[PDB]
Amino acid sequence: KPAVSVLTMFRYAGWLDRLYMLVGTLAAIIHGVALPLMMLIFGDMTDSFASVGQVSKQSTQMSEADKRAMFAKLEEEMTTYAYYYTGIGAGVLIVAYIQVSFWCLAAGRQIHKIRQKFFHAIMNQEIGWFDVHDVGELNTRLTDDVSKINEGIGDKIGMFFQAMATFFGGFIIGFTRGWKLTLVILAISPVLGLSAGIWAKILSSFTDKELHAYAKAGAVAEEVLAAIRTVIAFGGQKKELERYNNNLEEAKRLGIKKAITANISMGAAFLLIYASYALAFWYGTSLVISKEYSIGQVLTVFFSVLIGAFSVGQASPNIEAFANARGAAYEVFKIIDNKPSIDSFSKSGHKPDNIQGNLEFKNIHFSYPSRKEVQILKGLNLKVKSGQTVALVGNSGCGKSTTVQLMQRLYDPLDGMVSIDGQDIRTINVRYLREIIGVVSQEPVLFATTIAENIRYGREDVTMDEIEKAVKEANAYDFIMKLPHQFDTLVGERGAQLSGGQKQRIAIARALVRNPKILLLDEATSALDTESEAVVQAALDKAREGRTTIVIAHRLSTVRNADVIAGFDGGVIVEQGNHDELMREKGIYFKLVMTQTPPASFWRILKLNSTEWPYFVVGIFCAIINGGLQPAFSVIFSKVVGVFTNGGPPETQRQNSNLFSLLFLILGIISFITFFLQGFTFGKAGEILTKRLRYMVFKSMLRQDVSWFDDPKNTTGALTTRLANDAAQVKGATGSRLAVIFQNIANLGTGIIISLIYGWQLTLLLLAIVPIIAIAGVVEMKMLSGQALKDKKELEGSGKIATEAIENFRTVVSLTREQKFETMYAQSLQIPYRNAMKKAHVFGITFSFTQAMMYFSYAACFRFGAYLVTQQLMTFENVLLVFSAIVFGAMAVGQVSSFAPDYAKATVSASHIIRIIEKTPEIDSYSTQGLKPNMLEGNVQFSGVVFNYPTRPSIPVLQGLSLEVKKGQTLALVGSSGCGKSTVVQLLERFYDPMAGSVFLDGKEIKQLNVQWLRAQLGIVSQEPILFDCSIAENIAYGDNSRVVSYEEIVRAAKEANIHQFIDSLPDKYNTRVGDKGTQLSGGQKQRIAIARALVRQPHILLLDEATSALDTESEKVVQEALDKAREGRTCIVIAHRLSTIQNADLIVVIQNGKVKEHGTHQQLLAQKGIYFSMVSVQAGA
C-alpha cells in the first residue's frame, strides 16, 4: 500500500543511465512500431496478387500474354516488399539489442548503488533502531527487495513501451486504413474480456471447493494417522479405511462436476472467440463486395487492430512489475534517507588526547525502548576515579549493564549526563569514543576468519608481532600455538568450535590490541567453567593496570581487589566503598555475600489406470478429430481469402463468402462438442484414479507397523502431505497435458500433410526454419536460467557476509570497523556488478537474434513462395494456407515444451507413490494367518526379554525382563522411570517383537500367534485417550469391530465406567458429538469413555497405562474408582504412578534397568527395604 514517487526511485540514475533509458525507450518504441508495419505490407502484397488473381481469371482467352504483365508486376512488387521485409528485420535486430541491453545496463548500475547505499545505511542505524526491529526480516528484506527493484527498472519497462507502441501503432494503422472495421472490432472486444472474466470467477471459487473438499477427507486421515496406535490397538483399520473411502467418494463427485462445468466454460469461450473472429471477417467481406475496401486492406486492418488489442494484455504484467518495484523501494529508501542522532559515521566532535579516564555519571535516568512500560534507572550518581577499577553489584534488572551500555553511548540517557574526563560524552566524536573504550562481554563472538584477522578487527593496521604480544599478554598465546595452522586457524559458527574460555581470551586479546584508556568488562567471567575462569581472570587482571575500569559480574571472587564497590536497588545507587566498609554497612552487598557464601519408466501406474480401457480411447479419438479439426480453420481462412483472392468473375464471389463464413462458424460449434468431450472424459478419468490411488496408498499405510510410524521421517503431517501431493500430481500427467499433447501432435501431423501435398518444397523449406527458431528459442531460456543461477550464487556469498555483519551487529559497532564491512561488501558485490554488465550484452543478443530470425524467416516464406514457386503455376491461395498451417502447428508444439515439467513433477510424485504401496511390514494385521486359540483364560509370560527401540538403538530399555501374571489377578508394575514400565504394554499388544527372548499368553508364543486375535483380547487404556469425532456411542462402540455393538451393551459399559452421569445429562445423550468439533469436555470424562471402550470389548486382559497421569482432585478419585471396579474380574497390568492406589495388588514388581529387581505382594516388599520402600516413602512424605 505504501509507495514511492516516480522520480525518487531513480535517484541513482544520472548521465549515462538517463541517456540509456532514453535511447532504449526510443528503440523500444521503434521496435513496437515495427510489427504493425509488417502487417501493413501484408495487405499490399495481398493486393498485388489480388490484382493478378482477378486479371488471371478474367482471361479465359489468352495464356502467354498473362505470362508477361502478371509476372512483371509480381516481380517488381514482390522484390519491393521482400526488400522492405529484410529492411524491417535488420531494424528489429538493432532496436531489440539496444532495447534490452541499455535498460539492463541501467538496472545493473543502479542496483549496485542501491545495494551499497542500503547496507551502508543499515550499518549506520543507531542501536535503539535495531532494538525495535527484527534483524531477520531486515536482511531477508535486503536481498528480496532489491531484486524486486531490479525486476522493476529492468527491460520490463522497455517491454511496456514496446507494447504501447504496438498498441498505438496498431490502432493508428487500423483507424487510418479504415474507421469502420476498427469500431466493429472494438464492438466485439468487451465480449472476449467478459468470458475470461467468468474464468477468474469460476477458477477462484472452484479452487477453494476442492481444497475445501479434500480438507474433509484429509481431516479423516489426520485424526486417524495421529490416533493410529489407538486404531491399531482396537483394530479399526477396516473402519477408518471405509470412512476415507466415503469421503473420497464425495470428493470425486465434486471433482467430476467441476470437470463438467470447467470444460463447458472453456468450450463456450472458444466458441465466442471463433464466432466473433468469424463475424468480424464476415462484415469484412460485406465491405469488400461493396468495393469499399481492398481485400488486402481488410487483412491489414484486421491483423493490426487485434494485434494492437492484445498488446494491452501483454503490456499489463510489466505495469505490475514497475508498480511492485516502487512499493519495494519505499522501505529500502526509507532506511537510506533516515538519519540518526548518534551517527558513528559522522566526522564531528572532540577527539581528546591524554585522556586521564576520569568518569562520572550524573543524575542519569534511562529506559530502553521498551520505553514507558518500564524505567530501570531512576536517577543515578556515580564517579570512578582515574586508574581505579570499580565493581558494580546487583540482585536484578542488571541496571549495572545499563551503565556499560550508556558509557559507549549506545543510548543517550533520558535525563542526566555521562562524563568521560571533564567533557560530556556527546561532545566527543562517536568513532573515537568507541576507539578509546575497550569492551569484553559475557558471550564472546568470533567472526569467520583467521585468529590474526579477528585480532585484526581490533585495528586494521597491525603486524603479527602486535598480535603475538596481544595474545601473549592475554595468555592466549600458549593455548593457540598448540592449535594447528597457528594464527591462520579458522573460527566462527562453522568450524573450529572451541572452549568458551579460549574464545573469551581471544576477545580479550582483540580488545587489548585496541589499547583503550577505558575498559568495560560485563560478566565476562560469568557463564564459564570454574577452572578456565581463573585462566581468563588472570588475563583480565593483566588487561587492566594501564586503564581505568568499570566491571560487572556475579563473581564476588573478582570484586574484592576492586578499589570501589557499588550496589544498586531499583535503579537507585545505594552503597559505595571498599569491601570491609560494605561488610560493616551490612547492607545489600553483605546480603549477597552471605547468600552466595529421478526419471524412470513407471508404466504400472498407467497399468493401474488401465481399469479404464475405455474413456481414454473416447477422449483420444475425440482429441485427434479435434487435432484434424484445428487446421481446417486454417484451410477455410486460406480459401476465404483464397477464393476471394482467386475469384475472377466477381458475380460468383459474394455467394461463396457466405458459404465459407457459415462453414467457418461450423468448425466453431463442432469444436465445442469435441473439446468438452475430451476434457470431461480425462477429467472423470482423473478423479476415479485419484480415488483408487489415495485409497491404495492410505490402505497400504494402515498396514505398516508402529516401527514405521515412530520414524522421524514420517510424522502425521508429512504423511497427509505425501498423500495429497502424489495423487494430485499423477492426475495432471494422465490428465490434460496428454489430452493436449495428442491434440497437438495430431494438429501438426494433419497440418503438415495438407501443407505438404499442396506445396511441394513450399512446405519442405518452412520445416527447416521453424524447429531452428524453436530450438533457438529454448536454448535462450536455458542460458537465462544459467545466468540467473550463477548470479544467485554470487549475491548469495555477498548476502552471507552481510548476514554475518548485521546478525552480530551490536558487537561490530562496539569495535567500530563498520567501514571494514562496507569495504568487504563492496568487493563482494563487484563480481556480480561485472557479471551484470555481461548479462546485458547477452540478453540483448539472444533476444534480438530470436526476433530477427522470425522476421528474416518470414521473408523466405513469400520470397520462395513467390518467385521460384509462383513463377511456376503453384499458387498464392495455398501459400497462405501453409503459412497458417505450419506456423500454428508449431505454436501448438510450443505447448509440448510448456507441459514438459508437469510430467517430471508427476513422475517424481509417482516415484514415491508406487513404492509406498509395495513396502511391507515385519508385522501385518492383514494376514489371516495365526492360530485363533479356543481357550479363554489369559496368563502372561515375559521371559528373558531384550528390547531396543528401532528409532533409538542406543540406550536399551529392556535387558533380560521376566514377569508372570496369573488370570483374574492384577500385576502392578513400578519403576525408576521410563517406558520400561510402558514397553510391557506395547509388547503384549505386539507393536514390536523383542530382539531376544519371548512372551507367552496362554503359554503360546505371541510371535507365532495371530496379530489381530491377540490384540482382540486386550483392554488397553492410555494416558490421553484420543476420541474420533462422532457419536460418543460410536467412540465406545470402537471397543468392538467386525460387529456392531448393542445400545444396551454400550449402556452396560457406560454404567460400568461411571460416565453415565454426563451421558443422561446432555441434550443429545449418547448421540452427542465429542472431540471438540461438536463438543468439548474435560479429561475425567474422556478417560471414563476410554474405560468404556476397553471393557466394551470384554477383555480378559486390561492394560492401564498411567491412566490418572493428567488429572486432579476428585476426578482422580472417581476415575480410580472406575478403574478399580474394572479390574479384579480380569487379568490386568497396571503401571500407574500412584503407589498409594497400588497398595492393593496381587503382585507388585519393581523394574530396574530392564531387569525385574524386586517383586512381591505389598507387605512383602514393605518388609524388605530397597527401591520400592523408597518409592513409597518419598511420595507419601511429599
Residue numbers in the entry: 30 to 626, 689 to 1273
Paper text:
The transporter P-glycoprotein (P-gp; ABCB1; EC 3.6.3.44) is expressed in the intestines, liver, kidney and blood–brain barrier, and affects the bioavailability, pharmacokinetics and efficacy of drugs. P-gp belongs to a superfamily of ATP-binding cassette (ABC) transporters found throughout all kingdoms of life. The transporter consists of two pseudosymmetric halves encoded into a single polypeptide. Each half is formed by six transmembrane helices (TMs) and one cytosolic nucleotide-binding domain (NBD) along with interconnecting loops and short helices.
Prior to determining P-gp–ligand co-crystal structures, an improved structure of apo mouse P-gp/Mdr1a was determined to 3.4 Å resolution. In previous structures of apo mouse P-gp, and also for ligands pertaining to subset B, TM4 adopts a mostly straight-helical conformation characterized by weaker electron density, indicative of regional flexibility.
